[PDB]
Design a protein around this motif. Structure first.
Motif, mmCIF file in Angstrom:
data_model
loop_
_atom_site.group_PDB
_atom_site.id
_atom_site.type_symbol
_atom_site.label_atom_id
_atom_site.label_comp_id
_atom_site.label_asym_id
_atom_site.label_seq_id
_atom_site.Cartn_x
_atom_site.Cartn_y
_atom_site.Cartn_z
ATOM 1 N N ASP A 52 0.944 -0.993 -0.238
ATOM 2 C CA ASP A 52 -0.237 0.184 0.050
ATOM 3 C C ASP A 52 0.898 1.552 -0.023
ATOM 4 O OD1 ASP A 52 0.930 0.063 2.892
ATOM 5 O OD2 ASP A 52 -0.763 0.100 3.810
ATOM 6 N N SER A 84 -8.698 3.638 -6.019
ATOM 7 C CA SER A 84 -10.454 3.216 -5.828
ATOM 8 C C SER A 84 -10.842 3.109 -4.834
ATOM 9 C CB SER A 84 -10.601 3.221 -7.157
ATOM 10 O OG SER A 84 -10.568 1.548 -7.529
ATOM 11 N N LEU A 96 -9.880 2.742 -1.584
ATOM 12 C CA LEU A 96 -9.689 3.566 -0.314
ATOM 13 C C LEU A 96 -10.470 4.748 -0.820
ATOM 14 C CD1 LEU A 96 -7.703 3.804 2.292
ATOM 15 C CD2 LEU A 96 -6.648 5.167 0.136
ATOM 16 N N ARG A 97 -10.283 5.601 -2.254
ATOM 17 C CA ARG A 97 -11.290 6.672 -1.720
ATOM 18 C C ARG A 97 -13.436 5.965 -1.631
ATOM 19 N NH1 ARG A 97 -10.005 11.428 -1.937
ATOM 20 N NH2 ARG A 97 -8.409 11.295 -3.557
ATOM 21 N N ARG A 98 -13.094 5.110 -2.511
ATOM 22 C CA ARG A 98 -14.488 4.333 -1.774
ATOM 23 C C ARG A 98 -14.623 4.442 -0.317
ATOM 24 N NH1 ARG A 98 -16.962 0.750 -7.212
ATOM 25 N NH2 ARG A 98 -17.998 2.949 -8.074
ATOM 26 N N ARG A 99 -13.504 3.711 -0.031
ATOM 27 C CA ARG A 99 -13.467 3.172 0.972
ATOM 28 C C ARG A 99 -13.631 4.744 2.628
ATOM 29 N NH1 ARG A 99 -12.178 -1.367 4.838
ATOM 30 N NH2 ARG A 99 -11.314 -0.599 6.545
ATOM 31 N N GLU A 100 -13.018 5.908 1.733
ATOM 32 C CA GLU A 100 -13.430 7.325 2.971
ATOM 33 C C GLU A 100 -15.057 7.461 3.099
ATOM 34 O OE1 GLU A 100 -11.173 9.967 1.460
ATOM 35 O OE2 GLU A 100 -10.040 9.170 1.007
#
Ligand SMILES: [Mg+2]
Ligand SMILES: [Mg+2]
Ligand SMILES: [Mg+2]
Ligand SMILES: [Mg+2]
Ligand SMILES: [Mg+2]
Ligand SMILES: [Mg+2]
Ligand SMILES: [Mg+2]
Ligand SMILES: [Mg+2]
Ligand SMILES: [Mg+2]
Ligand SMILES: [Mg+2]
Ligand SMILES: [Mg+2]
Ligand SMILES: [Mg+2]
Ligand SMILES: [Mg+2]
Ligand SMILES: [Mg+2]
Ligand SMILES: [Mg+2]
Ligand SMILES: [Mg+2]
Ligand SMILES: [Mg+2]
Ligand SMILES: [Mg+2]
Ligand SMILES: [Mg+2]
Ligand SMILES: [Mg+2]
Ligand SMILES: [Mg+2]
Ligand SMILES: [Mg+2]
Ligand SMILES: [Mg+2]
Ligand SMILES: [Mg+2]
Ligand SMILES: [Mg+2]
Ligand SMILES: [Mg+2]
Ligand SMILES: [Mg+2]
Ligand SMILES: [Mg+2]
Ligand SMILES: [Mg+2]
Ligand SMILES: [Mg+2]
Ligand SMILES: [Mg+2]
Ligand SMILES: [Mg+2]
Ligand SMILES: [Mg+2]
Ligand SMILES: [Mg+2]
Ligand SMILES: [Mg+2]
Lengths: 25, 48, 120, 57
Positions: free
Chosen positions: C89, C114, C116-120
């Motif tokens: 990572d 992507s 990780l951004r959806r995980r925010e």
RNA sequence: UAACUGUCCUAAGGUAGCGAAAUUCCUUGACUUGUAAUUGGCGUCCUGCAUGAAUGGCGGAACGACUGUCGGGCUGUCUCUAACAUGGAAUCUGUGAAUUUGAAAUCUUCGUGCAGAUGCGAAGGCGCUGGCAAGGGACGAAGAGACCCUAUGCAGCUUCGCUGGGUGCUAAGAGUUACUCUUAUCCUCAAGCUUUUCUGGGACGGAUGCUUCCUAAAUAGUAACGGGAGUGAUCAAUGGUACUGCUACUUAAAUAGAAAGCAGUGCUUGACUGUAAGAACCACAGUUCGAGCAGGGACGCAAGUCGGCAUUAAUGACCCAGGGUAACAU
RNA sequence: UACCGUACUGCAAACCGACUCAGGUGGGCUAGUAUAUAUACUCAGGCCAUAGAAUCAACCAUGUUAAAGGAACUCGGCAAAAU
RNA sequence: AGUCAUAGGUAGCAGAACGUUCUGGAACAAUUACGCUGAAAACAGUAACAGAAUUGAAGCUGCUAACAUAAGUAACACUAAAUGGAUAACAUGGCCGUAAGCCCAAGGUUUUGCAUAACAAACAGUGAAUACGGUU
RNA sequence: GACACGUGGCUAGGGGUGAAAGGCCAAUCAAGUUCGGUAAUAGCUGGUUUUCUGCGAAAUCUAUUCAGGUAAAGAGUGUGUACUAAGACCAU
RNA sequence: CAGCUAUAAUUUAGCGUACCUUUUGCAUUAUGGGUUAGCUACUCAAUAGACGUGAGUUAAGCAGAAAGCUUACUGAGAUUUUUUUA
RNA sequence: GGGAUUGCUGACUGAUAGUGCAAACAGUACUGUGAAGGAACUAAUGAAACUGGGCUAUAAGUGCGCAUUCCACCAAUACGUGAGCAUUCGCGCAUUACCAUUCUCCAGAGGAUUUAAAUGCACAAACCUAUAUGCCUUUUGGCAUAUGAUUACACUUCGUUA
């Protein structure tokens, strides 16, 4: 008769530094 | 003006300094003495 | 002299060099550098240029970002680099898009970003 | 060496291909002129011998 | 004859069963047969130049467009050829090449001659031109390679020729953690390079520097795998100098030597540092002699000698590598 | 119930060999004496165009016959003859 | 303008010239040339002065083209066999007949038909209608 | 029959294939053909084309991976310099 | 070797071993060519030496050049002068 | 570096030369299974070999066609077109007529020589296509740094009114 053992040398084959982007996306 | 059937008759095959196989010019000692500086200076006479 | 030494390659080294030129952008290239081994014979008039072949392993790294494991072909030294700066990572975030001369590293990089951004 | 028209008109009264072919006539005309030199030199000896025969008779 | 003993280098000296044999020089091997007459076979014998159980030794049925021999029959293969048949050839008509070609108007014999003459010399011969035949000559024609030699020649093959990790296994580390990487190296595979010259051909043998004597012909010099001796050193004295006794040696040969010989002594290192006009010689590189000058010394009362040994052999360039010292540099 | 083949040649003067080349080229059908697709003559069918004309040259090729012998020939009965 | 001296040559060296094509100097062949000779040679007879050269040929078993020689020579002999005033339709004779007959394939690709010369290739000819072969 | 034939297919040059002959792989194969490097290289062989004039050798010697090659010396030509000669003969 | 030289002038006499290449030496029975025509071989660039002909000389050449580059020069105090004579 | 238009460019060549090809159809016919090799041929004139027969035995004019410069219409900024041999020691094309008198060897075969000209050859000119410092360069790229791995930022401003 004679001895002919070679001396090794490694040349780093310049390897252009950062990048280009002419390849396949 | 070349004569008859030698190696000189064939043209451009033998260097002028080849002397048969005795390398006489390679029998003299080699000197590596650099001359002093002042041979690179300009030399001017008091007479001039 | 290197452009000369590429043209002085023995046919096994030349075929391995053509395969390296073909399949470079298929594997991970973090700190990997190809190398030529030109050996210098003291009784002269013989310079044999060859290749230092890289070693390749299929390691199955665990991504701590998204919950899966990925398999991808690497070298020892880039595995040292990845596992000694923080893992997959941290490498795929902090090495941006141009020191990665690799296709699957770029694809897993986009999937990490992507997910990780959806995980925010 | 010798002009070709000169060789042809010198070989004018020869026989065979040595009259019309130029490179046969060239060798024949050269041999003819070599004969002419010796014949001119032998004229003097021949005619002196002829005169001495007439005086002797 | 050498069966059993006696010997020498030596892995070991070849069995019952083989042999003048696909293979044995003598050779027409002695022996029988074979033919009237046999050097090529058959069956014995031994004297195996240079035979022999895995280069498989000992013979056999059948097989062979395999090889060497004997009988019967058969007949032109032959003694010894003849006639005939068919188709070429020869005659005519029609169609219609090529090899070759310096130019030819191209005689014989003997001699001469790049050494076998149509062409030169001497003598002689010859009406001219063809068809059909024969091929002795035109060193007929046909291939600038039959054989030998040479090349800074090629090519392929072989090996205890040389060098290589290229190639296959192996060794030692390393990684993912069987596979892969790095380094090394035996034995294989594939290559790449070398593998002189003189020579009364080439091969074989022999030699390749230097010195002396004969050739070498009275300055010098002078050749041949022409002929006889040497040499690739020795010596801290067998060097240098100053002396002392005796007299036919000193050496590779020549020239020389009352010492340059033979035995001794007293000191010493000139068996040096830097040079050297002028010559001998000599393609060049080098080689040889060298009086004299300066330094510091040796011996000798001095005169004066000493830059190795009476001389001519014992003297391998340059490059490369190593050592001492000196200057400059870092 | 469309499209392509359908001429001619095909053991040959039309294919493969530079040729109107004595060479090479696959499969099938067939009558009688008669009996086998062998052999001699013949059926159906085809052919007698690609140099012609006479004649006793020598010689060459291919054969027929040959008196008395018979491998005597020859490196070797090769070639012929013979069964 | 009269005397003397020299003049054999291979390899080689030196000197003087001839010729071919093109260019510069404004233009040296519009209406041609043609007395047949001259010169030591190379040659000349349609400038000359300079220059730039793919600048001179019997001579490389050279290359290309044409024309000879051998020479009207060799060849026109594998076969069945021809004859009648014709490579005849007619007549006579002969040859093959497991081919030298017939039907196809491969291959060829118009080589296939027509005129008692001729003016004719420029013209014709290959028909799937039997469940012919292919295409599947 | 370890058979012959027909129609496509596969193995290609330092390679294929071979009941193994240095055989075959499209009439020159112990390394096919074609093209390129390539105007390879050849101390060897052959050839070198207009004229006139003047002079005119050498085949000895030394060295050489060299003795059919090359270089130096000797002998040639042109140019320069210089002597009645660094010359040739003859006499004493 | 098929010609030559002839006041020899309907026909004779004498003389005459092609060329090239390679060789100690070839008519050679050593190489090559059937003939004729066309094509076919010492070129060009840069650099170096020498000679011939010059240029400049305030040394020369290259260059736009008071850049620069390449060649070239820079030293000794040397008793000698009127046809003889005061 | 490369691909096409133009060259009042050529001491380049002129049909065995110049491209392999100047041509009705040259990368053709033809050769080879194939990759591949690869010709000849312009228009007149008509040399030699060769083979038969005979014999012997006035560096000028005049016409056309253009180019240059004048002129007058011009897009009005490079000339845009149009009368004119008006002008030029221009360029290209066309054209120029002799009349005998026989002592010339003739006939064929062949395609050299001579003449003519680039659509051939070599380039040239615009036209189109293809980061900075220093080391080595060698008709041009290999090496560290910097605006730097970043989807972001400066510029061709027509001005004129005493
Ligand atoms: Mg005479
Ligand atoms: Mg006289
Ligand atoms: Mg007959
Ligand atoms: Mg004789
Ligand atoms: Mg007769
Ligand atoms: Mg006859
Ligand atoms: Mg050799
Ligand atoms: Mg020694
Ligand atoms: Mg040192
Ligand atoms: Mg047949
Ligand atoms: Mg044939
Ligand atoms: Mg046939
Ligand atoms: Mg019959
Ligand atoms: Mg007939
Ligand atoms: Mg009888
Ligand atoms: Mg003379
Ligand atoms: Mg004389
Ligand atoms: Mg002019
Ligand atoms: Mg020429
Ligand atoms: Mg006839
Ligand atoms: Mg008839
Ligand atoms: Mg058909
Ligand atoms: Mg090859
Ligand atoms: Mg002599
Ligand atoms: Mg010699
Ligand atoms: Mg004479
Ligand atoms: Mg010759
Ligand atoms: Mg000949
Ligand atoms: Mg000619
Ligand atoms: Mg300036
Ligand atoms: Mg042409
Ligand atoms: Mg022509
Ligand atoms: Mg050409
Ligand atoms: Mg013509
Ligand atoms: Mg004529």
């Amino acid at each position: 008769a004679v001895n002919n053992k070679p001396s090794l040398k490694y040349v780093p084959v310049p390897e252009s530094q950062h990048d280009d982007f002419t390849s396949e996306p | 003006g070349r004569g008859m059937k030698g190696q000189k008759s064939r043209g451009r095959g033998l260097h002028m300094l080849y002397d048969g196989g005795q390398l006489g010019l390679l029998k003299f000692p080699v000197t590596r003495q650099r001359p002093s500086y002042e041979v690179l200076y300009y030399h001017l006479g008091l007479s001039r | 002299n290197v452009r000369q030494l590429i043209s002085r390659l023995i046919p096994p080294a030349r075929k391995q060099f053509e395969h390296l030129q073909a399949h470079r952008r298929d594997v991970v290239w973090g700190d990997t550098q190809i190398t030529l081994r030109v050996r210098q014979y003291p009784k002269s008039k013989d310079e044999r240029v060859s290749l230092v072949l890289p070693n390749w392993h299929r390691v199955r790294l665990w991504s701590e970002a998204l919950g899966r494991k990925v398999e991808l072909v690497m070298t020892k030294d880039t595995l040292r680099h990845i596992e000694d700066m923080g893992g997959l990572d941290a490498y795929l975030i902090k090495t941006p898009e141009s020191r990665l001369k690799s296709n699957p590293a770029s694809a897993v990089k986009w999937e990490v970003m992507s997910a990780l951004r959806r995980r925010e | 060496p010798i002009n070709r028209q000169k060789i042809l008109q010198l070989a004018s009264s020869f026989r065979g291909r040595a009259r019309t072919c130029i490179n046969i006539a060239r060798l024949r005309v050269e041999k003819a002129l070599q004969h002419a030199y010796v014949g001119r030199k032998l004229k003097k000896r021949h005619w002196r011998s002829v005169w001495i025969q007439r005086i002797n008779a």
